[PDB]
Structures are given as C-alpha cells and as structure tokens.
Symmetry: D2
Subunit: 301 residues, 4 copies
Amino acid sequence: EKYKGVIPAFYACYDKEGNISPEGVQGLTKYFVKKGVKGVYVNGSSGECIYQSVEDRKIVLENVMKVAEGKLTVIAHVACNNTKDSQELARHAEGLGVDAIAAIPPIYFHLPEYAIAQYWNAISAAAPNTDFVIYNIPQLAGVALTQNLFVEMRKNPNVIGVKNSSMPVQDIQMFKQAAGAEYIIFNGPDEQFMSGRVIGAEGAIGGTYGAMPELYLKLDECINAGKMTEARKIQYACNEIIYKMCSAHGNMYAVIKAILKINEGLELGAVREPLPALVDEDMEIVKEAAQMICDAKKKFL
Amino acid sequence: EKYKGVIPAFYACYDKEGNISPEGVQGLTKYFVKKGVKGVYVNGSSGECIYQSVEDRKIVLENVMKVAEGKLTVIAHVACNNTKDSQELARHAEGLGVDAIAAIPPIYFHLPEYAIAQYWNAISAAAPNTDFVIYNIPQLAGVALTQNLFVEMRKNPNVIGVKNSSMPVQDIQMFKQAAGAEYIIFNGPDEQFMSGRVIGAEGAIGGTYGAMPELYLKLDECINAGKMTEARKIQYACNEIIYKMCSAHGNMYAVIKAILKINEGLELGAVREPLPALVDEDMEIVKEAAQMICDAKKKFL
Amino acid sequence: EKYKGVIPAFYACYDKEGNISPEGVQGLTKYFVKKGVKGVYVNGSSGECIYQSVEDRKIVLENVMKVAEGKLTVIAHVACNNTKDSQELARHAEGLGVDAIAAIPPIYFHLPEYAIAQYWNAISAAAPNTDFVIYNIPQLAGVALTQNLFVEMRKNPNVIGVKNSSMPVQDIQMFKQAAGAEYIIFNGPDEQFMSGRVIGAEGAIGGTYGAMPELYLKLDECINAGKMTEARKIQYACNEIIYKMCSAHGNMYAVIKAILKINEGLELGAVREPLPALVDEDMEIVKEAAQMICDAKKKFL
Amino acid sequence: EKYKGVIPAFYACYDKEGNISPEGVQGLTKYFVKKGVKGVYVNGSSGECIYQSVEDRKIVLENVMKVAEGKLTVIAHVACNNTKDSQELARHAEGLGVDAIAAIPPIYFHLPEYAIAQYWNAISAAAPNTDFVIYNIPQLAGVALTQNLFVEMRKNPNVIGVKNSSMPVQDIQMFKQAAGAEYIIFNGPDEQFMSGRVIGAEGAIGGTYGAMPELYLKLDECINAGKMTEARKIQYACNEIIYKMCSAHGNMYAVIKAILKINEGLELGAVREPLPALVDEDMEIVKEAAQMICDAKKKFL
C-alpha cells in the first residue's frame, strides 16, 4: 500500500560548481512533500545516477532523509557498475532507514541470467531487512526480464516487485499475473501511465512526474475513480508536455530543472556531462512547456 | 461509429482438400452475426492472406458478403505482395459493397516511405469510394508507421485511420492525438485490448477474438462502463487462454480452428503450410484451452 | 566446383507492358554467358520473385534454360509465400534440369525452426534429385539460421549449403566450419565480397554483379591469386558504384536496368510496383554510375 | 605504422583480495613484450574498465608504463560514465606519455550525436597532444558511428581513427574509404580478424589475443604475405578456441586468466563482479582450451 500511487523519480540537485547541493536536495524534497505525492525514487537514472560517484549518491539520500521520513515513502536506487559499489550503497541506504532498494541490471556487457541474479541477490544481501525492486529495462540495459529470471528473483523474500521500463503493457500484465497479490509492478513509461495502471501496475515511478506532479496525482485519482475520459484528457495533456520537453537541443532533465526554476523558483543546477546542456535557442521551448504545465493545472485541477 | 467495438479477424475456412470452403466461410460468418460482434476483418494475416491466391481471397469475401451485409460491418484486407494484385482485390471488394479496405505495408524488402505511400495510395485509388485503413506493424513488416508517413496518408480523404499492431500503446495515443476525432485507431495486440482501448483506440481488431467473442464484448462493455477491475479480470482470463493456445506445437490458428470445432461444431479445416499443423500431443492443450473458454464465459457472462 | 566463383542474381526482364519478356530473359542470359560468369541465380529477390506469379517465374526459368545449359550453372530460387506454390516451382525447375534449387525461409510470420525445416524439406521433396541451397537472411525474413536448424537441414542429403545474406562474416565461418568440405557457403553481401570469400565462402551470389560482372570476376581472380591490395582496390571501386546506385530515388534494380540500357543496350524494362520507379532527377545518378563502371573496367581489367 | 598489427586488449590483473595488482600488471606487460606484439590496449572493456574506479585505472596504466615504453605502443582507453572522470584519465594518460587515447561512446542513455561529439572532444581536449581513437560499438553502447558523426570527429586533428567493434566488415570499408590514408581502422571482432584486415583495417585490437598472441601474429604474417589458405586455417583454429572459452559458465576473461595461469604461470586474479566467476565444472573447459592453444601453436608456428 505504501508503494501504490505516484512516486516521482528524484532529480540530481547541483550547486553552481557542478557538485551535489545538500540545500538543493532538501529543497526538492520539501517540494514533493508539499505536492502530496506518495513517495520519491532516489538516485535512479532520472537522478543522473550513472554520472554520480558513490559519495555523491550517499549525500543525496542523506539529504532526502533529513526531510522525508514519515511523510514520503522512499525507494533508493543503489545499482552501480560494480557489485562492490552497489553493496556499499545498499548498506548505506538500509543504515538511513529506507523503505525499499532498487537495482537496474548489470550494464554495458550482456551478462547471463545467473550473473544478473547473483548481482541483484548480492545487493539484496547487503541490505537484508529492506524491500527490493528489480527492473525490466530492455531498451537501455540490453535484454528484458524473463519470467525464468523473475521466478528465480521471487525466491528472495525481500523482492517486492518490478519497475517495468519496457514499452509493452503486456509485460506488466504477465509479471503481475505470474507474481500475484504479494508483489507490485511499477509503471515505467510516463506516456503510458494510464494504460500500465489499468492492466495491473499498482505503482508508478516516472522521470517527468517532478515537472507536473499534481497532473499525475489527478490522472491517478481519475483512474482510481474509473473516469477514463477525464484520465485520457490528462494523459494527452501530460504527453504533449513531454513531447515539447523532448524537442529541445538540451537534455529533458535540463529542460525540467529550468521549468522548475520558472514555475517553482527551485534551483536544481544543470545536468552532468555527457548529458547535453540547454542552449539559448531552447529557452523558448522551456518557457512554452512551463506555460503548458500551468495551463494543464488550471484546466484539470 | 460503425468501426467502434469488437471486430474479430476472420479465419481461413478450408475444406478437407485444403481449398477455400464456401460453406465454411458462410458458416463462420453466421457464427459472428450470432455472437453480436460489431464487424469482421476479412483476409488479414489471421485469415492466412499471405498464403492465399488472388482467386482464393475473392471467394472468401464473396461468401462473407452473402451472409454479412446489414448486420456486420466488413473491413476487407486487400494487400498482396504486388501492387497489381492488391488493386485487383481493392476493385473486387468495392464491387461487393464493402465498408472499408485495409492494407499492410509492402513486405520482405524495406522500401522508402514514398514507395509505401505510393503502394497504399495506388490500392486506395482502385477502390476510390471506400474507406481505407493503414497499418503500423513494425515487428513483421520491418519499420513502424512514422508521423511523417501518417501525415502524408491523411492527405488521402479515404484514409479513416490505422490498425496499430505495434506493442507500445503510446503509438495509439500519438496517432490519435495527431489525427483527431475524424480518424480511428484499431487496437492490434489482443493481450493489451483494455490498455489500447482506454488510451485512444475506439476500434479493436484481433486474431484471438473468434475463439471467445463474448469475452471481448463483455471486456469492452466493462471498459465503456468504466469498471476497470471487472475488465482487468476478463483481460487476464483472455490472456491466459492465449498463452495456453500459443503453447502448442501447431500454429495458434490451427489450435483456434480445433477449439471452434470442440466448442461450436464449426469445421474450418486446417492451417495452410508453411503454418505448422497440430500434432497428437497438442490435443490435450486444445481441450484445456476450449474448457478455459467455457469456464471464462460462465464466470464473466 | 560448378558452384564456386561469381554467380550473379538474374534480374526481372519485362516488356513495355510490365509482363515477363521471353526475349528480354534470353537477351540477359546471352549477356551473362558472354561475360564468362560461373552461373546465374534465377528468381531470387533481386529477380523481383516476391512480386511475380507462379506462371511468371516458370516463364523466366524456361527462357534462361533455352540459352543457359552447358555453359552456365543455374540455381533456381523456388520459394513462395505458400509451401504448395514453392513445390510447384521446385517440380518445374527439376523438370527443366537446373543445377540447384534455393529457398528463403517462410516470410511475414516468424515460424518455429520445425516449420521452417518442414517448409524447406517439403520443397526439397518436390525436386528430390536436385541440389538444395538454404538461406541465412535475418534482416529481411526475421531470424538467422541457427546451427541447430543447420544441423537438421544437413540430414537432407540434397542440401549442398547456405546462401549467407547476414552481415557478420563470422556466420560464413561458423557454417563452413560446422558443415565441412562437402558443403558450400555463398557470400550474400556484395559490399563484403572479398571478406566473405577469404573466410570460407567458396561461392558468391549478388544482386549488383549483373551491373559490372567483369569487376567481380577480376576481384575473384585477385582473391584466388592472393593479391589482397589489387582485390581491395576493386572492392572499394565496386562499393562506391553500389553506394551511387543506392543514392537514387528509384529502386537499385531500376537504376541497374537503366545502367545496362546505357552500357550494354539491354532492354530489361522497369521494376514491378511497389518497387519505386526512377524519376527524372535520377538520370544524372544513372549516367554517373554507368560511367564509374566503364572507368573501373579500364582501370582494373 | 606504430598502430599497425596485433594490439591485444590488456586484462585486469588482481591480487587475491580483488584489488589491482601492480606486480600482476608489470607481469602481464612483460608477457606481451616477450611475445613480440605491436602494442597493448589498456583499460578497455576487456580490461574490466566498467568495473574499475578512477584510481584503479591510474594504477594499471602507471604499472604498464614502467615496463612498456620504447618496446610497445600503448593505447589507453580513458572513457568513464562521466565526462569529468574521463577527462581526469585523459590528463593522467598524457602525463605518462601514452601513444593514443581511446573512448567508447556515452553508455546507458542514447544521447544525440552532438552530445557524443562533445563527450569525445571534451576528453580529447584534456589530452590535447595525444592521438585519439573513437569507437563504433552499436551492439553494447546502443547505436553505430554514423558517417556524419565521423565527419564531425575528423575536424579534431588528434583523431587518428576508429576502433570498429560492429559485426559488418562493410563498416571498416566505409570508414577507411571516407577517412583515407591518414586514419586507421582497428578490427574489433576477433572471430573476423582476417576479414577486417583484408578489407581495410590496418590495426587489430582484441580481447582474446592475450590468450594466444603468437597465433594472431602468425595469422597477421599470413595476411601480409597474402597466403589466405594458411591464414584461414589459423582463423578457424582461433575461432574454435574462442567458442570453447565462451562455453564456460564463468566469464570468458575468467577462463582466459585461468588459461594464462596453466600455459604461462601468470597470476592475474579473478574477474570483478558482476562478471561471473568460474565454477568447478568449468575447469575441464579451461584445461581443454589451454591444450587447444598449445596444439595450435605447434601446428602453425
């Protein structure tokens, strides 16, 4: 129940020198508490985790935990390129009393299911009294979570479910059907939020949620109320905002941090290289998207 | 409105000699009229169109039209490997007073968008007073319908919409949003029926619908009524039946024709080679699926 | 030995009405005999086989056989969408005394290996005293020829080898190593001719060979002589000609038939729709490629 | 000329505690000097670079440079998940006087060509008086090096060429043809060594070279001498050894470190997790491969 609803992915908050900002993180966590979201997914790829050091990630979760404790549920993504660094973040995260721990599969190399199962179980062993969520992200990490690797992962009692980042909503259905009522599948594709929710995803973690959290909460209220016409209107509004945010030269998360600077006065810094920075030409796209968010809120809330 | 709802794909009906059965087609069309489905999608890939001659396909539509006229809406899939053969089926289909005409993209070779646009427009020109539905089937025909090829196709006024066979429900959303209220997107993936319907597909054409039409009609009644829990229960029941039907050595359509022989006494013949025939070992799978259909009907209807 | 060397794919020869030209076929076969190539691969995809009727294909092979008998070795590609039509071409081709028969896998649907093995064996049974060539063309027909399927097909004694259309030259190496000296692997990718020939392909069948057969014969003479610098110079010359021929709006085979009209006075007609026709703007590309062929011949022969 | 020939990828040398072994690195570098290879490719993916910290990689190159100076040419792979960490390794490597610096594209996220060009140019700027090698590795890093991106990177005068890890040998041909005589393309796929070397790769960097360097040097001597039959015999021998090394449960590099322990008495440690360790059942595969290497050497040297 504590994992059901809208859990935005937590962005990377930098200072003007390109280093993790404790004030920025505490600031962005106060924003999510204020917006009334269910939880926060920390140090995921939307949090620029691929580009952070082990110490950078410890500082983010530490500062999220100063603000978020009995108000938001926190999922801490702890996977690293190494099993060793991943175990260190898993220990650390359990040390700060986190709700769940998450892990993408091993990266760059396409390892067998036994190595993937060993990687995830080794991370789960480093935080043995906390919930664990596995992934299905074939498009970035290579291959999709099979039902055989998932059966193997359900042998670990800490596994509470899957973050389904693949595009077929059938994957959600198949994992939910195979796992049953004691597991949860989180909808990954923000653009298919309503579709992944109706077919079986009781959870939803997304990288665009932070830009317009009230829209996803309203969309979720319509889904739970069963008004699919009002839900479909909000989904379409969210999707055109995403497509506008993706039309910039600069990275989507650079666009989102500039939207939050306009709409909320939050200073989250820039995006870490190699993510492309915003250019002068993107500011009109950044202003247009920020206004589309304000307009959607007035129309649907 | 005449295209909205459940439109099953019409199966290939053979005699015991492996030739098209007029009695079998008329028989299977009386079955769909009786079950109260919105329409019938004739000579699509579920109708073994890849394996039929031009004359075989004319005989099927002729016999569907003897039974179906003012009771079912009929979409006739007329694409062939050639533009020439495709135009012949398009003429013929307009000759028999068909509702719409459909066409997969060119096959085997990956042709440019201009050749695909020319192929589809040439077929549309051969039946110039009938509705035309284009495809998005990247997984079989090679590449996905782009928004640029779709913009080009909307210049033809006979184009009423798209049959979306790709897996992302985002594709439905994007095509519906780009096209607007004067176009329809038909949900292709049977396993995501409820998800593709809520996000924007007002139509639904599927190859498994014929095996359990009352389940898809009930599922659609729940979707239209907004009861997503009862819809999700029917979707899961349909999906486990599909997964059982796909677990046979013989082809799914061979399994379905044997299920319809058990549950309805319909004799639709076998599947045309190279489609794999059922083996002795598949009969227990065929009996188990037929019983799962009977059980689903009693539970949800 | 009769299959070793340069075997160009035989083009579709039409009259001005878009129907198969007996005079055109006999004409194009006299061209290949004159150029001293090892054989001719008839009714393959470069021969527009996907777009020909069963009777169209019988007329082509009949007319190739009037000219080619004891001078060229003939491989007749007999696969059709159906097993039935494929068997008819296999019978017919054996009736005319061809050297080998070839077959792409089943297309559009992704069938299991047993259905593919049954399709190919059924075609091989229709011509039981003639050599049979299987394919590996993952990029068009879906999935690559696995070693398992290849082991299964080596149980049929008529199987003489594989036409390798995939891009990895490792595939040639792996099939040659697994099969041994009693089988032949034909190099498919014209642009990697020299690379597939050195790693194990003793055969070579290509769609661009007909445009400049003397260049591939010279390239092969260098490969057999072990002069890799002169071979690499010819390969690069052939590859820039191919890239120029592919830069047209009209299909490559439309470009090639127009080059053969300029350089040889051969009238092979146009390309069958949906293959895109040449436009006025392509004639400069067609003239430039024809001159690059003339220039390559003078430089390397 | 200093980059032409056999450049093995340098393995990760650990102590029994799983930390970088200075003695192990110096030891493995003395091995390559002794075997008479052209150079050594340090901290590439075969060097477990994805799993090393910035300080781990500095220690490896430092210890390679104590042994290798005027005897081997050194290519130091400096890419990291961050641009920042990558620049640090680029500075460091230039500080130790390496011949060239190499960089895979940005990983996990699929960034635009401008971000990839910026990432590589930023790394090249951190070592501005040293040669730079770009990659084409679509299978692991997502998308292939386009000609457009390659044209952009040739604007940087430090770019000396491409390490081609894709499977089509046409890619080598196309990059060599476009770039000309002032650039070099290194053959990536060890299994296609002879095929990439004949079509235009004057360089060759591989992960299996370290297990049998004398075989690749002999294979290269045959290629340069133009004896394609003796080259093809060595290629086939190398390829069956690779396929045996890949048949283990444990990772290929774990297999190779155990082969070097048997055949050379080198102690390179194990593979860093998540790379799967060898199991008891793999020792027979490890012994069989080591013997196949000894047998190949006696047959071809």
